[PDB]
């Protein structure tokens, strides 16, 4: 943590391989105006003023996540390298037109971490283009005046993508570019999850992706964009296999 002026945050990293959250602190300076937006959120350029431990900011207590989902140790984490002092990165806030709940921010970040695991599994098949999903983290902006809630301003953060940002499929069956890898990845996740876990909303710059969406058959978890069986069917029905699907020996779909 740097002595330069900015604002403090409690920073949360989910680690799927131990299935726990890692709680840290950081300092950041975020530009006043967003540089981009989507349907539900605005994105802001931000600079990191360092990452620290959470020892100054005890929990007490019963908010989410529960204590048994929290790692008591935080020495290792991605944040300390990826959000080191001077890093430019992105902060995302929901637009008021506030169905956002605390739990929801953690679900979205966990989701992205789960997709990051699917990315690695895909890559281990040695496709022509490896993919990768960016880290994402929850941040409690503790210096800001609490919401109407009385519980702090929440946001999520992630590394800055540099380049032409494109969305390749939606979370409801749209195929928005001609690229193969994104669709073959979605398909891969559908077949290899035994249809239990489909990753769509494949978007980003080249093959560095962010803000995906998972569908699961029961619709539970993975945020509000989890359209369940319907999401899954809609993907698989508009999907036309390409060469990558074929290299991955996936069951051929004709669209
Ligand atoms: N990590 C990033 N780096 C750089 N630019 C980004 C990043 N994430 C998002 N953007 C840009 O910000 C816009 C809004 O992002 P995002 O909000 O994540 O997408 P979305 O699918 O519209 N759903 P929502 O999250 O509701 O907006 C995107 O369309 C991109 O132009
Ligand atoms: Zn396919």
Author numbering: 552 to 612, 615 to 650, 653 to 810
Task: Pull text from the paper.
Dictyostelium myosin-II heavy chain kinase A (MHCK-A) phosphorylates the α-helical coiled-coil tail of myosin-II, causing contractile bipolar filaments of myosin-II to disassemble into inactive monomers. MHCK-A is a member of the atypical α-kinase family of serine/threonine protein kinases. The α-kinase domain is bi-lobed, with the active site located in a large cleft at the junction of the two lobes. The α-kinase N-lobe is similar to the N-lobe of other protein kinases but the C-lobe has a distinctive structure and requires a tightly bound zinc atom for stability.
Adenine binds into the far left-hand portion of the catalytic cleft, with the ribose moiety and phosphoryl groups extending towards the middle of the cleft. In all nucleotide-bound structures of A-CAT the left-hand side of the catalytic cleft is in a closed conformation with the P-loop clamped down over the adenine base, ribose moiety and phosphoryl groups. Hydrophobic interactions with the adenine base are made by Phe586 in the β5 strand and Val643 in the β7 strand. These two residues form part of a hydrophobic catalytic spine, comparable to that described in conventional protein kinases, that connects the N-lobe through the adenine base to the αD helix in the C-lobe. The invariant Lys645 residue in the β7 strand is also involved in binding the nucleotide through formation of a hydrogen bond with the adenine N2 atom.
